[PDB]
């Protein structure tokens, strides 16, 4: 019946915060946008300012071309009919070129040539954004933890669309650009490679994805439980350990027999999450290139009755 600190009771708005100018080129940083009261019930209300530098323009333009290229092909598949475009929006797909072309770039635009053009734009947009993540932290003097955690997600993305198709020897092994289509690619991948459930790195990837939800539920609920002592201010709890950090530690020590610190819990956090895609990338890379039947592979390694 008491306050649960899940939504704010009183919203307070002051002058718009322009952010810290550590080493950031202020001419590239825009102005503050509108204040959203709807967002203010849950988190901050201030929107913006956003920084848009050289890598921001490169990522925005390359990704926009990738987005527009898929959309124009979707319009082509709809026959330029808006009614069909909305009706079959989840059914359209930009398929990779057929396996008969292998890794060649001599594939017609309708038969995978547009997939290569769109994939090139996506390649530039994602890597340009990664550098943007690195350079934003560098301009503020912060650590590069964000960029390296992003690199783990890029590794799975690179394996799915680039690294494994090269190792498998054809672009047809890659993921199509479609809502329901890339769900069919995911399902077909498991059936082709013999029940990907028995891929040990797929199982580990799920263990960390499950553990990410478990750990964020634990950490999110722990901070909200000690936010009555200022626990949400985690940086000042690291520098000057208050009673919020001690109660948070003692709850889990009395529960689990061991605990974390205000800073070390975020080392558990970043590793639990990056291991999802790091381990996931290895498991996908091992499928087709090393193991083609994971259930048969399972049977020869325990994991399944003979």
């Amino acid at each position: 019946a008491e306050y649960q600190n899940i939504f704010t009771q009183v919203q307070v708005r002051g002058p718009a915060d322009l952010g810290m100018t550590e080493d950031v080129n202020l001419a590239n940083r825009s102005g503050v946008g509108p204040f959203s009261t709807l967002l203010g019930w849950f988190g901050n209300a201030q929107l913006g300012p956003i920084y848009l530098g050289s890598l921001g323009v490169l990522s925005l333009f390359s990704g926009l071309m990738w987005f527009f290229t898929i959309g124009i092909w979707f319009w082509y598949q709809a026959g330029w009919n808006p009614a069909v475009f909305l009706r079959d929006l989840f059914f359209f797909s930009l398929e990779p070129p057929a396996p008969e072309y292998g890794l060649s770039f001599a594939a017609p635009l309708k038969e995978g040539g547009l997939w290569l053009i769109a994939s090139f734009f996506m390649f530039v947009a994602v890597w340009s954004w990664w550098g943007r993540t690195y350079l934003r932290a560098q301009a503020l003097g912060m650590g590069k933890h964000t960029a390296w955690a992003f690199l783990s997600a890029i590794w799975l993305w690179m394996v799915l669309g680039f690294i494994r198709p090269i190792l498998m020897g054809s672009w047809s092994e890659a993921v199509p650009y479609g809502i329901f289509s890339h769900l069919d690619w995911t399902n077909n991948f498991s059936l082709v490679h013999g029940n990907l459930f028995y891929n040990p790195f797929h199982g580990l990837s799920i263990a960390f994805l499950y553990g990410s939800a478990l750990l964020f539920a634990m950490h999110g609920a722990t901070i909200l439980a000690v936010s009555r002592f200022g626990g949400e201010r985690e940086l000042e709890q690291i520098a000057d350990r208050g009673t919020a950090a001690e109660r948070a530690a003692l709850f889990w020590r009395w529960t689990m027999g061991f605990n974390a610190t205000m800073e070390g819990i975020h080392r558990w956090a970043i590793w639990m999450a990056v291991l999802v895609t790091l381990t996931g990338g290895i498991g996908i890379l091992l499928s087709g290139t090393v193991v083609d039947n994971w259930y048969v592979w399972g049977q020869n390694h325990g994991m399944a009755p003979l």
Partner: peptide, 27 residues
């Protein structure tokens, strides 16, 4: 606010005109 009018008018006019020709393009 004359600015917001132009953005709202400009988007509606452009998207419908694109849509109108696309409907013509579809047939």
């Amino acid at each position: 606010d004359p600015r917001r009018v132009f953005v709202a008018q400009g988007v509606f006019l452009f998207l419908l005109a694109v849509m109108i020709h696309l409907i013509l393009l579809s047939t």
